[PDB]
């Protein structure tokens, strides 16, 4: 019974910020690395970010590393990640996963589009 559900996109100007969530239940969730995953239409899956468990540590991928920030809240079962310094390669559906990979996906999906 694992839920995972993004929030948090829209339309937003390059140079923009905005923050994702990504709400779970149905597993111990402060027990689990997490993971951002995104997919521009016809590009394909792009690792973003991922998280320990506990916080301890977090990974960027080099296209986004310094600009977009993974965090959690274990108390509230929910998983972030702030863009900021939005650029037009960042338009795509955002995906939050229960692994390290990006690969335990769950959810719908965020829309983050950088407007023009």
């Known amino acids: 019974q694992v839920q995972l559900q993004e929030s948090g996109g829209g339309l937003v100007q390059p140079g923009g910020s905005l923050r994702l969530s990504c709400a779970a239940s149905?597993?111990?969730?402060?027990?689990?690395?997490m993971s951002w995953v995104r997919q521009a239409p016809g590009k394909g899956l792009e690792w973003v970010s991922s998280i320990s468990g506990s916080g301890g540590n977090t990974y960027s991928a080099d296209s986004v590393k310094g600009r977009f920030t993974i965090s959690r809240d274990n108390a509230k079962n929910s998983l972030y990640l702030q863009m900021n310094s939005l650029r037009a390669e960042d338009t795509a559906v955002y995906y939050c996963?229960?692994?390290?990979?990006?690969?335990?996906?769950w959810g719908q999906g965020t829309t983050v589009t950088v407007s023009s």
């Open positions: 149905g597993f111990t969730f402060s027990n689990s690395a």
């Open positions: 996963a229960r692994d390290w990979y990006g690969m335990d996906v």
